[PDB]
Amino acid sequence: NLVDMRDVSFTRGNRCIFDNISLTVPRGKITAIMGPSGIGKTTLLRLIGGQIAPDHGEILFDGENIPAMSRSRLYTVRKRMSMLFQSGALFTDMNVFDNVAYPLREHTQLPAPLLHSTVMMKLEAVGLRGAAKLMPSELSGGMARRAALARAIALEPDLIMFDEPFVGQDPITMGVLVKLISELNSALGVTCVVVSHDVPEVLSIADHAWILADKKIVAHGSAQALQANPDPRVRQFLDGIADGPVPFRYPAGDYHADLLP
């Protein structure tokens, strides 16, 4: 196991997010952490990277403390994470060729003719070799998300975190991003963490599902044992039904007192 979130609990000043949740992911596997909108699915990956510190709890980085090394030591662990974001996380003041080689000019010591042979072939893994001298503002929504995948494999990481991928896109580019995770899991040997909410496509590539409901952990089954779970909260996050544990209708607010008078 890479990260061991035992008793982590995140609570803001107004509304709390996590209260005694538990996450477990092994190495070389794909684990999808699904959940509805409204809850802090973006802030779940921030605790692994160490950008914010939790109130009560710890993240065990395979025998190493995450929020206890904030003095010139978190940067040595952050070089092998390469967190991928939902929107375009690449810079707009340069071309897309300098975005992929951006961790290669400050961390690795590679010459200039050797850098052109290790970055141009990284774009062939995502299929963007011909689009190398193009501006990031000229790319589309699905094309700019694939440029951040070549930047994620620029330092050979061990735990890639996909913060809401292939959401709000066409099914042409949605079938591309689901295939690139399976090609980078077996041929490279990395761990992918997906926190998307799209049900009928993330279960075909993942090996562990973690459905969040009532801001707690209610499901910890696999990709095949999740559909046979007799739970009212787990099955409501499946194929579309309106009624369930959460109500789509607002409760009784004295409808007879404001309709006729």
Binding site: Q109, L114, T118, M121, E124, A125, I153, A187
Partner: protein, 95 residues
């Protein structure tokens, strides 16, 4: 950690092909590239995307001398990354 010995018409790499130990091999490759007809590597740990670009540059400079090179004893971890990056057969002769 990277070290190599000079054998007559035989090159062997012993160590790890990381992204920081390729400094003395890149600066001392001009006077040693003309003596390769076969590549036989046995003791390797892992070949990443930074060490794979160095092996691609040792093929094109050897083809201009007049002879071609072969590749034997290649581990399965190197050939797995060749299909991921869509590498052709002329830059990496496999069997």
């Amino acid at each position: 950690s990277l070290s190599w010995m000079q054998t007559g018409d035989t090159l062997a790499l012993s160590g790890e092909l990381d992204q920081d130990v390729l400094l003395p091999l890149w600066e001392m490759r001009e006077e040693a590239v003309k003596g390769i007809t076969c590549i036989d590597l046995s003791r390797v740990s892992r070949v990443d995307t930074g060490g794979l670009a160095l092996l691609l540059h040792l093929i094109d400079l050897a083809k201009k001398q007049g002879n071609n090179v072969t590749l034997q004893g290649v581990n399965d971890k190197v050939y797995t990354l060749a299909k991921l990056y869509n590498l052709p057969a002329d830059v990496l002769p496999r069997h």
